[PDB]
């Protein structure tokens, strides 16, 4: 009949057992049922953020249905899940759709009270017959839905429930709303355990039930796009199919959790991977590492050291983010150097970062262009840079440079930042900054340090400078820091070591370009006789590197003097470098 | 203690609605929280505030950093402590007469750390409810309630935030697998290694952090620590290590 | 059937082996068997640029399914692919894009799950007038389909990240433009299905000459939608060369015809003091300054992360400073239309620098833009121009700082504008009268010297720190602009040749022209509108009265204090 | 024009195809205004598509680059069959040969002459 | 005068939108005889408006000194000598012509008051 052509009974499917296994949502079948039992609009409505389980919600009504675990008015009842589309698709012609919903509705009240209907996806049923002067499904359904001689039951969205049914007032009084909360951690690892017989029989693999409390945990830590149990049930599943392609393809047999943290890995890349002893090793050798482009400088290397040894070692604070520090010094100690320095670190790469220079920001509107502008204003639409910069890798380093140029009425935003990691766009959520490391620089006391950093220990000086910090910000805000560190004026022999690391990545550079090139060391001591000043540090060395290397030099190989394959030594003149052929 | 009135009142720290003013610093964002008026670009997205009120009538609001808005934000406010009714762009009523206000400032915390005390409560109560009266208007603040005032934290409260903060930290490590005990002589450095009245409670946090974790995750990833072991966080003459029995 | 109506069995010619023999791409494909074999959530789609081969890596599979090289759960398929441009197209009025899909869908449930079906563009599904979210997102989460989505992460996110219900049931895979080499591999997998079509052999020197050329040439087509394009319209060529009325082998000479009009590259950067002087005269120690800085530019020692060359031009300012830029965007990338003339005298404030990076969102020139940014993004192979720089903010040296260290910059709405690929130009005259009363026998060198001294204490010396090298603009002398004068009449002359006047000159004519508007002071451009708007304006007076004939020797003859044109 | 059946223009349709399929490549078509076989009212366009990819069809179309650009290139198979074959303007001594090539026909046509200037 | 109206524009617009001009021309306020002439001229399509009504017009010079002296100011533009024109000559004109007083064939001459315009039916 027109129940054949247009419903599918869901029923039917359990009674042959082709449904999933549904285990908890007591309160929610509970006052779905007290709502199917009614006299006036018996009609519950799923209302739940899209992928919390509401489908799985009536299918497990269904199943307690086939197994007899309902009261005695709904014992033999059908479920029969209402399709749109076998109603919307063959009608062009007038009256055509109507015709079909109408007898439908005459079916559903010939089968005295026995039926009940389910409605996946009620904003598809909003706006189903819209046709220039048509009825859509609410002007038909909906006398004999406030008259109870209908038992359906919606599945939606609580997004598409405001644009698609609060529109429409009408229908919108006709069901009852049941709000379907994402469930919590634990009872989310007890569905997945309910969960685990069914992936067993289609990928003939096991799972480690600590891999299942662990994708939960994880999932629920770190990822923010989707829901419970939704994205879970996702880490599991690809985890299977991973594991089903390194068996089948070309070793093990189960689903560890060090799969699941490398699903997640390749997913987004938070380092949530077990410390293997390439990487254990390599953390273990961070300030080693760090020296290999930063020479002198030393504790700030051992407080960020610390910091992201206490992240990876899984002893994070779950809420703060990463490290919330603070760098001090006089201009061009390589503070940038060492943020670049994490970034390759971290991500082989520098500029596989964000840096934000403050400098540009020294009025205080420029609030509105990093946390975005409100709904009714310009750039609406956009999002602010930091916030979505973030909330693509939220794993990533945020750099604040030139702090003390800026108002001083910025740094509520990362009060906010750094007191929970959160912070809210102008559209209006949350972006979760609990994967993010903050730099902030400035030059506050250079005249201090570079005075007093001689004859003085470390701990009275980053306490005078403390003190310095009480007179420029806030207290609420350097309370929000983790660690203040303190820079120093380097020594020749630190601008000496950075020469040596600038004719490294040079020969680098020139083997890319194909010439074996050497130097005179004593080019090397007239080059740290030039570029050197204790107060402004290496930049002068990077102005002389960049006028008596890059200028005569690259003369010299465009004069076609330099041949591939010669020994190149770049010895002196009376008062210059020169380069030799042999 | 606003989050330990969520953890009350609905089984979760983070499920609260918190709204800082620290966004708010113009007299603009208003809109967003009460949302776009008609033919605007977020109009039919509503405010942020009197949607999530529809959803959930039941809550919390929170308001921290509450002084750095520009001052003429508040009256928003005005309505939310008269009636309760808040009227976002799409001209309807969301009811906040379930809802928890409440704001958390520091209008005169200098004042409050020098006075409080050799001066009563009622009369440090008096003296910065003045000091709000400079930096409110009276209509605001007729309407609240009870304006409480928060002195700082002694020797005896700063040992039970360091006891509850190594209750998390080992409630972390136990799933981390490494149940650790330690001396009560480092409880005593820690309380002298994280104590100035000037700042709370951070400093002792961010000492603990520092103090305890750097040498537990320099051992731990030292390939060194196998759980289950007892594990003591017994003192140097300056340091506190982490033993293995 | 109704799968003769809409879908393409790739089974069927695989099973024949008459399609494309699909190399490289292999992790795509294995991620595709990534997701294609989970139980749920089996629609895995494809992000990427249009023309990087989704199609073959789609039909690359189903050569895998043929040979066997897949696991055993992929086995038995049917691959096919529905038109998303069809079931819209042909619907008229309310459900026949729902008719036509819900037949899809139950032919396909007789089908019993054994078929994988391809769609591309799943942006058009979205968006059809409702039509498909609501009837695929169920057999997206039944499992029964076997899609196989192909669309652009911008459009992915235009429309389908909207909805997250959508979102979540298919799977991204990134499937980016392939390298030049991985070009070469492909082809040298297809130079055989060539050679075996048009019976000819093919060059392997010119297929990695295409494959260089169409990567730096043209950008309207991409890799390895380009290569093929070309080798085949090449090869076509060739065969009508042969089948004209003689080589088999395609050569790179096509290729590079085919290229330019369907190599002068090098030692034109090498002879770049010669492309200087193709139209400016004089300021013959400028140019050899720009040329070795030029050359220094593609010498390729200096910072990646730092532009061509950052500059301050002093001087006289009209005597050719713009036409040297003019000049300098032509023979540097294409021609005189790649630039921006910026006036730094405007720029004196806060809201200056608003104006010109980018508003700050919610105000007053936001989607207006920044000044400078906009119009670098709209042309990213420019050179940037600036006037009076001594004019501008103290502030905005900060964001010229930022522009010669970092090649970089965010603007107002927050992204990255490259500089790494102009020149920056700032023009001054500071040091005017310096240069003008000591134009006299004094040198290049210690002159530009003198003159650094005294703008090092106009300016910051950090900011003339990241500046490679100021030029002098001399100013040039009575001959050299008297020969511009000519090279402008020289232009006159072609555009009325283009009107098609036979035109001579008195030489005292070409004296008293020159002698208009000469000035030291001002630049070229006054004696420009001088002799324009003396020779011009009477001319047409004289044409359109009816006393002029094309064809005509017209001398400009000399009156006592004017000139005459005669008819002769 | 001779036909009035939903399944007699389609069998003469078909009928035609399947004769170029016999004829196996010595019929190099011609088919103007291919968007209007896209919408001409299973549409011929969509038709013939398999005929597009089966590889059987020696056809050529004629039509706008608006049509060509959006009924064509944003489609798939009827993108990959093709290409941006464009017909230039040509010069005004083109347009003047070929007035020379048929001044003769409008002559004889009318009865009249025309003058070259 | 054209050079710093130029840099003017170059602070409104783009630099080279405004070379694209053909040129920058300047409309400036006139003298005193290019009134007088273009009152004449609006007299005369007032004498063809009530030539089309059937009526026919003299005008006193002195009348027409009266409005170059009434309707004068450069600072503004045109239309202050329109409405002298519009008020000083129609108003009293419709103020007679709704009276059905003035028969057609009649001269209506413009005769003058101190200040003010006249016109009589002899
Ligand atoms: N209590 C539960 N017991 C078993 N499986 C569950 C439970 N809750 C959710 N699931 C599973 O979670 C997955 C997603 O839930 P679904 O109901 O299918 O998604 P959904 O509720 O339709 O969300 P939307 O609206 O489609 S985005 C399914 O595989 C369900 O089997
Ligand atoms: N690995 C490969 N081996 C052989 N041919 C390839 C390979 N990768 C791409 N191609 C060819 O490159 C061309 C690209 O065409 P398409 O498959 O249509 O590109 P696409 O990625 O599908 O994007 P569009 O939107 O369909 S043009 C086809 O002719 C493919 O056969
Ligand atoms: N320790 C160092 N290691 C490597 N490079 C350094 C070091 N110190 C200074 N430099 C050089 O000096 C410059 C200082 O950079 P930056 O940190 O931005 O200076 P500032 O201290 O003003 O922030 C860098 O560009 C780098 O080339």
Redesign the interface.
Known sequence: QALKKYTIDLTERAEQGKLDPVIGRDEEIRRTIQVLQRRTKNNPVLIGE??VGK?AIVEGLAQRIINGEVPEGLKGRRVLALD???L?????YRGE?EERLKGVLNDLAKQEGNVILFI??LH?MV?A?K?DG?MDAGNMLKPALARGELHCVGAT??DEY??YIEKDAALERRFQKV?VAEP?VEDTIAILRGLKE??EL??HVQITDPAIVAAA?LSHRYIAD?QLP?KAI?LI??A???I??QI??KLRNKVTDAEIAEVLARWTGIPVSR?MESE?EK??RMEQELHHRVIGQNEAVDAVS?AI??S????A??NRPIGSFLFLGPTGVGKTELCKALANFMFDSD?AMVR??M??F????????????????????????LT?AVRRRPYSVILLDAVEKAHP?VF??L??VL?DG?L?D???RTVDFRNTVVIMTSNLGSDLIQERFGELDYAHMKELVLGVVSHNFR??FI??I??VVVFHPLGEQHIASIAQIQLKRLYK??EE?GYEIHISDEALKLLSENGYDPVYGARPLK?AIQQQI??P???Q??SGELVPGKVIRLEVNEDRIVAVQH
């Open positions: 899209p992928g489908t749109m589309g076998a919307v698709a063959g009608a062009k759709f996946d996806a598809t706006g017959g046709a048509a969205t609580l405001r644009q709000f919590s069914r992936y289609h990928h945990t989707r939704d996702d599943d690809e299977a199919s991973s089903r392609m089948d393809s410390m254990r953390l273990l610390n040894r206490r990876r070692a899984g002893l604070d779950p500029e934000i220079d400098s540009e020294m009025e205080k509107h420029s609030v509105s262009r990093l946390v975005g502008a409100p709904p009714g204003y310009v750039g609406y639409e956009e999002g602010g840079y979505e009425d509520n935003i009060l906010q007191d959160r809210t102008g559209q209006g207290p609420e309370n929000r983790d660690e550079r020139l370009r102005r890059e200028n030099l690259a003369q190989i465009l």
